[PDB]
Paper text:
Considered as a toxic intermediate, this compound is metabolized by an unusual enzyme assigned to the D-2-hydroxy-acid dehydrogenase superfamily, glyoxylate reductase/hydroxypyruvate reductase (GRHPR). First, GRHPR is a dual activity enzyme. It catalyzes the reduction of glyoxylate into glycolate, which is either excreted or reconverted into glyoxylate (futile cycle) and the conversion of hydroxypyruvate into D-glycerate, a precursor supplying in the gluconeogenic pathway carbon.
To go deeper in the specificity of these enzymes, we determined the crystal structures of PfuGRHPR and PyaGRHPR at 1.4 Å and 2.0 Å resolution, respectively. The asymmetric unit of PyaGRHPR crystal displays a full dimer. The electron density maps obtained revealed that Pfu and PyaGRHPR enzymes are in ternary (enzyme + cofactor + substrate/product) form. Neither cofactors nor substrates were added during the crystallization or the cryoprotection step. Both structures include a cofactor molecule, unambiguously modeled as NADP(H), within each active site with a refined occupancy of 100%. The PyaGRHPR structure contains D-glycerate, product of HPR activity as observed in the holo form of human GRHPR12. Contrary to what was observed in hGRHPR structure, both active sites in the PyaGRHPR dimer are occupied with a D-glycerate molecule. The conserved Arg241 was proposed to orient and to hold the substrate for catalysis through two hydrogen bonds with the 2-hydroxyl and carboxyl groups of D-glycerate respectively. In the PyaGRHPR structure in the presence of D-glycerate, the network Trp138, Ser291 and Arg297 superposes strictly with the one identified in the human structure.
Author numbering:
A (entry chain B), B (entry chain A): 2 to 333
Write the structure that this text describes.
Amino acid sequence: KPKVLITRAIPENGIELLREHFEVEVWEHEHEIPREVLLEKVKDVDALVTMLSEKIDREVFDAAPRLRIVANYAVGYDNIDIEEATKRGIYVTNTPDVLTDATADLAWALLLAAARHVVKGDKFVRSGEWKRRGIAWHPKMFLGYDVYGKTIGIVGFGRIGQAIAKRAKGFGMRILYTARSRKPEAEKELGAEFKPLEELLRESDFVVLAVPLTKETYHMINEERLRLMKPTAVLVNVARGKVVDTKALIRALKEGWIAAAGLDVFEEEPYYDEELFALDNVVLTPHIGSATFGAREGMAELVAKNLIAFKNGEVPPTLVNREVLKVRRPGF
Amino acid sequence: KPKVLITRAIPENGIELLREHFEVEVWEHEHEIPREVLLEKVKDVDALVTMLSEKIDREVFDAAPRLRIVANYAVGYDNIDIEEATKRGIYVTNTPDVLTDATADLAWALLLAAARHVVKGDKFVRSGEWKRRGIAWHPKMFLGYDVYGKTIGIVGFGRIGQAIAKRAKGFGMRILYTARSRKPEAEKELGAEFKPLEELLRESDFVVLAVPLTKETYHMINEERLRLMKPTAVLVNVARGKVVDTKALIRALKEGWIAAAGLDVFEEEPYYDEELFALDNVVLTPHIGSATFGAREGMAELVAKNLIAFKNGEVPPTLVNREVLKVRRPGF
Ligand SMILES: NC(=O)c1ccc[n+]([C@@H]2O[C@H](COP(=O)([O-])OP(=O)(O)OC[C@H]3O[C@@H](n4cnc5c(N)ncnc54)[C@H](OP(=O)(O)O)[C@@H]3O)[C@@H](O)[C@H]2O)c1
Ligand SMILES: NC(=O)c1ccc[n+]([C@@H]2O[C@H](COP(=O)([O-])OP(=O)(O)OC[C@H]3O[C@@H](n4cnc5c(N)ncnc54)[C@H](OP(=O)(O)O)[C@@H]3O)[C@@H](O)[C@H]2O)c1
């Protein structure tokens, strides 16, 4: 009976389903499994369920001679060395689709919060500042940015990006996108227009990032790109922190190159930066894009389905490295 | 040349347009005009531009013998004694439409922030607590409520309510509404379904209030209605504070009768309440529904147009108390 290590307490639906087909060890602690502890525990396993926090690299593969499949509890897989996995006949799966709507909802929450000063406004009320000042209402108090009918620019036009666009249609927006290729069916269905990155940045009132982290997306939103954005524009990052040059973003926010930003993801996590966190025109969330009951349950069910399919000699439904099919047939 | 007092520093477009046709006094101070000061200044005026903060009642009318028209810098007019105005031949105008998109955007900002813990999350990051606890990401961290595909119940289905529904369509929602009359064109255009209030409250995952304050809407969201709502539901109030029984809402939030609330408006303003302000599951904004430059500019242009139309012997374009037309012809 094959052994699986699950590196965090995922929802019980997934754990229980895996227990029917695997011997299951779960890392029970809130904190990330320590690196030395991971390398010790993988020695014996046939499968892994990993979080974005575990770096599944050559060193891990060398420590886990029986390892045949890694199911990421995440749609991103920048934490896994995919090419090295393929070379070794190791299957890698992810969790697309089940978290699309949670992440797109969160991107929209950030867009609107940053646009209309929701965080600063809440503190203004909650701290008693509103009351202490004695002024109920003023025609110039807390003026923010219109969203309805404006232009949204979506960087990355896959599952999450297109979901962000569906919501934008409810807001009557002009929709621009960039991607590695045109998406002509999505253009027709969503009314979206393909643009080079730099033209998108120049024309957009709202820029939302929904790309994977790759060599090519690393620091794509740098100083030069931030300078192209409108001074009234709002930037939202629900992708990966390293897509943005944080030092450049801090200058942009402080000096008024852009109006505001909503950030769910950071170059190091958990993140603290005194300079960024002092700014009224940033809205911050602790990497909670996929944090709904429904999404996290669906993720758990999907990691389980992938490992069970593999055990049954089937191609896992959300296999990422399809080239591995030529290296080794599925199964333990 | 007729005299107008404008009780707040509204956008210059409106003030300047009025200066072409009226002798204009503007109350330019940060604080609202004191009651005793208002009663002194109205003695001499032919017209007023008022904010929601000024109570235009029998006492004001008795102090202002030349007063023929009051233009509220607001779509709401619960601060004006309309029946007494009509009896005296005084025309009352408001600012519909020009602020609809700002207010509906803000309602959506509140809905999403309350649903996904944006305010609480921001403080968790900004304070350094996220970093100090040392955990980047966890499958159970900050789980919130799915919005896409859920049911929204919109209480009041006029200009702002229908705008809230247009946005909901981008979120693929089932749309319920209640109002004093059925809206068959809106049903066809928006896919919205009419329900009695109590069925709407039972069936909705998100309830948004967009009614005026009247004798009938006063405390309509009371203990009984909050108990009918789902324990997972989110309530958003962009209407008037007095539509909700705040004491009952506090019990509902604390005891889990509903999940969360987003509030832009309160029974007293500015508002202070230690019990409500202690709650993680409320999101607060300081009555900033119409707070975009474009909304506020349009409001200013519209108050000016109303007073100028009246001066010209025309029916003002956003006259509220149309029965006054039988009492006195327009003009000074
Ligand atoms: N904040 C969170 O909690 C959270 C949650 C889930 C996901 N995420 C992040 O969101 C990412 C996207 O997920 P998804 O399901 O939408 O993935 P996806 O369907 O693969 O979409 C990614 C899109 O990015 C585009 N892209 C890739 N490299 C690009 C480049 N260099 N320039 C421009 N566009 C580029 C792709 O273009 P092509 O289609 O032309 O190849 C694709 O359209 C994940 O990889 C993850 O890092 C974050
Ligand atoms: N938070 C802010 O900054 C902000 C900004 C602007 C406005 N507001 C508030 O929002 C209100 C609505 O503005 P609007 O332009 O949408 O007005 P509206 O177009 O007159 O719409 C009001 C809707 O409420 C309905 N209604 C009235 N009494 C009701 C009751 N007892 N039960 C159920 N529905 C009832 C009306 O029914 P019928 O259609 O049958 O008449 C109508 O559908 C304003 O009056 C103001 O108080 C707040």
